Amino acid sequence: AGRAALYKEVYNVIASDGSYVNYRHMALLVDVMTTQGGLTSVTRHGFNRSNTGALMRCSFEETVEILFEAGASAELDDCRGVSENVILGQMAPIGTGAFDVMIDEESLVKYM
Amino acid sequence: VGQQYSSAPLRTVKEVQFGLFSPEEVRAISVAKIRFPETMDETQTRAKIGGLNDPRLGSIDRNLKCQTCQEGMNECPGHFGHIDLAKPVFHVGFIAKIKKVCECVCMHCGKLLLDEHNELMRQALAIKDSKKRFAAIWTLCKTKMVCETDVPSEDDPTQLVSRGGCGNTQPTIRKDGLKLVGSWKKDRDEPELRVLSTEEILNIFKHISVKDFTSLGFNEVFSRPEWMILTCLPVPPPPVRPSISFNESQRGEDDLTFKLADILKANISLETLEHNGAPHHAIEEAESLLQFHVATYMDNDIAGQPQALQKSGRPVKSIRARLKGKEGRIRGNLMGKRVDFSARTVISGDPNLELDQVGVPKSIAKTLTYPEVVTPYNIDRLTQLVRNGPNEHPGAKYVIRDSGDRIDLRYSKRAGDIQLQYGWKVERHIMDNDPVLFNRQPSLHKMSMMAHRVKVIPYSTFRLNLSVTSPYNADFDGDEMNLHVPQSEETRAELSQLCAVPLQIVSPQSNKPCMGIVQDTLCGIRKLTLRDTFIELDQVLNMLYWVPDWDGVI
Amino acid sequence: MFFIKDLSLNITLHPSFFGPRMKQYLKTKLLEEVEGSCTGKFGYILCVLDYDNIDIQRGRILPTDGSAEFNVKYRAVVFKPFKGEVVDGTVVSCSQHGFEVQVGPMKVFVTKHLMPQDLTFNAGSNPPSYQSSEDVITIKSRIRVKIEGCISQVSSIHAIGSIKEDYLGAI
Amino acid sequence: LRFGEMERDCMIAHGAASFLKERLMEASDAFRVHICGICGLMTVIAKLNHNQFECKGCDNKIDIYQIHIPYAAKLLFQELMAMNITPRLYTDRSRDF
Amino acid sequence: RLVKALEDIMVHYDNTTRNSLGNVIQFIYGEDGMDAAHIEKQSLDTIGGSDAAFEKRYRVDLLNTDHTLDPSLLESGSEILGDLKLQVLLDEEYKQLVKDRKFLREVFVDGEANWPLPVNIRRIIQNAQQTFHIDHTKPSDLTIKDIVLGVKDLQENLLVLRGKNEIIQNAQRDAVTLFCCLLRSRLATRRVLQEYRLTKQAFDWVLSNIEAQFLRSVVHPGEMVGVLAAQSIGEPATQMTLKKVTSGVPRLKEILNVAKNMKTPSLTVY
Amino acid sequence: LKEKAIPKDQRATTPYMTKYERARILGTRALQISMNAPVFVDLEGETDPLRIAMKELAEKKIPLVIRRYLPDGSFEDWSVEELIVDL
Amino acid sequence: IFVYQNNITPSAMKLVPSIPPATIETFNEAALVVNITHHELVPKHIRLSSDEKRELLKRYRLKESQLPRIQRADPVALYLGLKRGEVVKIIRKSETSGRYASYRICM
Amino acid sequence: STSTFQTRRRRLKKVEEEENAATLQLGQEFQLKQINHQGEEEELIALNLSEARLVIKEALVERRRAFKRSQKKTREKELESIDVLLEQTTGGNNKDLKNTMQYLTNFSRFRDQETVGAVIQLLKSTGLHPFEVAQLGSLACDTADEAKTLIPSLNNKISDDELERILKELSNLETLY
RNA sequence: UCGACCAGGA
DNA sequence: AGTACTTTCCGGTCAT
DNA sequence: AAGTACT
Ligand SMILES: [Mg+2]
Ligand SMILES: [Zn+2]
Ligand SMILES: [Zn+2]
Ligand SMILES: [Zn+2]
């Protein structure tokens, strides 16, 4: 029910201006804020504390502070984070990169 | 990238294991003793002493040598060095924990303060979350200040069971500057205040149990609490703290290269006290100095004021400060960079380009280049551009051959000569219809960056179509815009197939198109409509001629 | 002693060769970078078996250049001596510090003082030898050696062997 | 010019995967370093000529990789190391999922 | 913020919305798996309107001189009147359009019937119209079975999720429900013949199109939805240039922060 | 790893090619083509790689396979051949 | 289920989790005057057999953690009395598609 | 390089590299329990000379064949017969294989894939470990001592009489020249 | 030639 | 309830 | 400047 409100309110902030945003968006956000458990805030205090990798949170509001307690608790980073890769110079699993491409030697013969 | 082939297989990083350096490793890794604090001048004689920077580490003066590693400057990343401290020191950023850990374990024997025996503890030992056990465990035993030797088991509170021993009361602790102090309460009365020497803490940790580590948010292999205390100090190599030479007979050393210089000094001075007139505690007045420097070197924006100002009152750039958000490494070097193949100027509308185009001024199109690969399909056209030169427009300015070597088209005694080789690359000029990424910051839209078709035009401005104005959110009152040029046959694809303005027309941000018709065109499209408005032959004809796709049917 | 280990390799193929008979090329290159190789963990790679059923799997295309990368899984005949391994081979070189036997693709060397005593070293011989009461060791003479210690290096493996134990010497 | 945070976010939204990389690597930083397949570090003393590779300490010469990462990132790492923190670069996942 | 807090969220190939942990955030992007781009405000006619009018429009009774399709519309008009085996499909249909009504009135209590929905049906037909030069004069050639049985055969193919099982195929029905209401609303026997004189040709076309068009409006696994949704909110937040409540920008800030002490607290009790 | 490899049957992803997929196939193919790779369609005179790719991809004569990973890591393999190309 | 009026003594409550398997719950009168589940906003939840759950997981290839969670003390979690591990199925109305099926595990 | 069917999870501290001795302790890459490509388990594969000579020739041969389907589109006597099989299906710069064929073909102890078969069927009743079940096949041995001493991994795994019988049936199968 | 400030542009 | 602590694209000058 | 979270 909270979600329902949290959304309703957020929706009103955008409607009071006479603008329009398709549900899905405000929803998605209102959802991200809720799933975890209750009201997770969109601030260094909340979300940027989740189980997400280090390098990722690392790029927002606490950096070193976060990096320090990373090597100290021997964290392990998946490198599934958009950020993660951006920092490494690798292709992020995003749209164009949400999959791999291969040369099927087989089909490469029926073609001739 | 980097150049020069390596018989080393190449992969992508898949995981990042975070840890803490073990003095022993630090040493193994190092290729430099690092004893002297000086820089070079082997008695003014220019070079580098086997003291600081390059006692075998990286280099300068444009000279191969990197421990024969040669390759020189560009290619030889740095090679860490080390420097054996005198006495254990904290890690400016870990102090917080180092303390919170002691409050979790009692000295002398060094072991937990709450076994499976205490139930409230059990619950805190099932929680699988390093950040959370350790945040609950602590809250539980920060209070108890008596290393219990006998506790009431899962049975009668009458019968007492035994475990580890040494009831030596536990001292509460507080933080004063960079040192830990605590009081031991004596009953019969009054406290007992003494400073917890690093040498001591370090030890108590060394003895903490294997399953004790882990129980508390740690890791037997990558980060044993005992490592939060610095015994051996890694010495970042030039590239981390490069110089800056005004030719020769001058200096140019970097901030860091000084704090080490300091840390080093402050280190030696100490040593020369424990092997000489050691007025016992006239030393711990110079051991705090090491703890300081080796602290400020990493973090220099603490609570205990002393900024460690460097002669001239300039603050001192601590390592931490280099990563701190915005304008720094992480956020301003990795998440966002300066880049090549880019240009920017003033934008002005032009009611004559198709929506998806963008007017690029010859000036730029002759500057920006696109690497094309010599192929039978283009050989001809390509060789022509080359011949053409880098000054005429449709031309090019660089041909690179398999032998990884750049032929600078504007100088090379063979500019006019040259026959291309299938496989060679011919960095040519941007030409009519080279998809490009156009954009106007602040970028807060998919649309703040769109792909247009390059239309080389005269005069100095990016001439964008009107209707694609409201998406970038731009006017011509002196607004500037950025242009980025793709580089790989596949990169373009990524622009042209997902970023092309035509595509952006209808926006998901509000399930409605996001570009329309404005100003004249709009204002005018109304008038031109009205019942009252009629047009006569002579003109109806020109108008017809104007819609390029007119079927030619008056 | 000779083994038949199951190995695999990764070859990076340029789009160029993305022809009709690619498989062919791959295999071919597999062979260029294996047959004749050497490691400490595999020792001498000598010959790729079952040339025909070589598994290529689908190779994946890298992502900056079209080069694809296939994990060619194969099987082959290997051979890596060990310390304490007894083997016989043909002598090749013989000096005043010992003779060097050649156990297959490898060369085991035996020190003058790692042989017996009654076996001296004759210099003014042609070709160079080592004489005994009843034995004579020189070039072609076949020996049976006990590899005392192994030393891996580059693209080869050397080792020192003795002939001071029993049932060790000529044949 | 500068391809800042916002300019990234847009490409991410576009799903313009490779392009992003291209801006961040090839058209800027892009650097090639060598790793220890054992202790995920830059230790490796690569002589890229006599193909020697070593890495005394974790002591190698055999298990070594090569990677491409923004020079700024290399630095990020080296900097972290000087702060006594270890960022291991592993070329294969072992934690599954 | 908004952005950095949703970077990692994208639709994965299973048609679920997750982040870098794999934590499902939405099981179906936007509670429907449709890409915002392919959507328009349509009207669920089945909702508004007097209980009276509803009948006069969707109700067909083959057992009645005044509630049957006048044979001037259907080719097989006269030979149908009275047929009982048809009046069962004809009643099934109606008991459904009715179930629909109540359902919608349970979701959109406001009565508001205009909503963003994939596949613009109004137009898809408008073309069916002048594409076959359909004359509002001569009679159709659709079997009542033709209509009712194809419309049903349509919904079967509007696949969002695919899965080969119950739990999944069950979500399928869910994430389509609303769209269909609108579907059944516009392809109701009476309508299909009295309002838009469709021929078998037209109809079969209208169907094929609705399916394909729908299938396009699905979301592409790959879309970095998070960054999207973020900007989509944060963008019009910049354009905010400024009954006695807390307001816009400052309020939004208040919400995202989840502040305990909000300037305006209010509370409306009915 | 084959437990992470899903059968051609039991397959469940979209039967249609995602815009990113094709976007990348074309690119990737183009790239290779510009690399002097072999072209499986008669160039009706074309000479631009991404153009040839657009052609290869329409006669579905592109020897590529899109491997679609799932959140848990298991993947599904599809062929440009199979994949329907609406857009 | 025990319904107290103004409160229970902190000496008493520490006697509920002392007799497993059996379980006990504490509810205040004033909190039960109105059924929260009847509220316009709160959509209907549902318990899932440790059969229906082991399924939901297998069908999405989800690990327990990646699942949306509900508070052990969440109002409705109590109304039905969940247990650390039980999954609730949340079915609500939607302005994009009539009904939306969601799941909440417990912590 | 050329990875080997077993991803040993190396967690930083690589230090325990035991010795290599006829204590049947061969590198981790040669335990008695290694893994086959299909994913199955399989006994190590120990080859005694002349048994190898046959496995190599066998492949080097069947190579020259599938090397022509595609082409369209007595002691001293075998030295010459093999040199050719190489200068046809080998890299020619595999100076090792050459030298491995000489050695392998000179010190070999069997000529028939039938004789090598019996050798195996015999030794494979010993329960002995592959490496021994190799050396025994490629090393002349008259006494249980010449044996149990040049293959010290035997010592207590087989009664001298028994091992002596085996040595008897070996010289009896040992093809002439 | 790392930087600190100030003025200013959309 | 009080104390403590981090965050808030693109000339000229002076000097380290 | 403010706000929260942390002690
Ligand atoms: Mg402006
Ligand atoms: Zn070097
Ligand atoms: Zn104690
Ligand atoms: Zn190493």
Side-chain angles (χ1 to χ4, degrees), chain E residues 126-253:
Chain E
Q126 281 199 60
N127 299 314
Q129 296 273 281
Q130 72 119 63
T131 286
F132 299 74
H133 296 302
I134 278 176
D135 69 323
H136 302 285
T137 62
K138 295 191 174 185
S140 154
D141 58 308
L142 315 172
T143 316
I144 274 188
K145 259 195 168 189
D146 264 342
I147 286 190
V148 169
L149 273 174
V151 165
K152 213 168 183 173
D153 250 307
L154 178 53
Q155 306 178 190
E156 281 304 292
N157 283 299
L158 312 188
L159 306 92
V160 168
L161 283 167
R162 271 146 213 301
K164 192 89 174 184
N165 84 63
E166 189 83 315
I167 274 192
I168 297 274
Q169 279 279 309
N170 226 302
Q172 163 58 36
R173 298 189 200 94
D174 300 308
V176 183
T177 318
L178 184 37
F179 175 54
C180 306
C181 307
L182 160 66
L183 188 58
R184 294 162 215 148
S185 160
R186 314 292 194 68
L187 303 175
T189 311
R190 247 287 168 56
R191 237 153 170 292
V192 189
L193 304 117
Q194 191 162 295
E195 294 180 53
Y196 14 86
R197 296 285 192 312
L198 292 209
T199 78
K200 158 98 170 184
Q201 199 158 43
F203 194 75
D204 279 301
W205 188 71
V206 174
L207 295 192
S208 174
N209 269 287
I210 288 186
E211 157 154 30
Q213 224 149 76
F214 181 89
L215 283 176
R216 292 196 200 114
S217 298
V218 185
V219 170
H220 284 252
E223 282 264 289
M224 296 296 315
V225 182
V227 172
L228 197 334
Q231 309 186 327
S232 308
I233 293 180
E235 186 279 323
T238 302
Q239 306 289 297
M240 294 198 260
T241 293
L242 295 177
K243 286 180 175 180
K244 297 185 180 182
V245 169
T246 311
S247 306
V249 179
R251 167 56 171 175
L252 165 55
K253 194 190 177 190

Side-chain angles (χ1 to χ4, degrees), chain D residues 20-80:
Chain D
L20 205 168
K21 173 186 174 193
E22 214 205 58
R23 289 279 96 183
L24 276 53
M25 285 294 287
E26 286 76 55
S28 168
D29 276 297
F31 179 39
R32 193 273 274 83
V33 222
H34 287 286
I35 327 182
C36 166
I38 270 173
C39 51
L41 306 159
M42 313 253 218
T43 335
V44 183
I45 285 192
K47 297 200 180 188
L48 314 170
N49 245 306
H50 310 296
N51 291 301
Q52 305 167 58
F53 268 105
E54 277 194 82
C55 169
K56 355 86 292 177
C58 322
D59 183 302
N60 209 300
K61 238 174 180 183
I62 280 176
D63 202 47
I64 278 182
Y65 296 67
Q66 171 215 51
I67 60 175
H68 291 309
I69 60 141
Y71 184 110
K74 155 210 183 177
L75 233 170
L76 168 74
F77 300 155
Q78 279 178 310
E79 302 188 293
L80 278 172

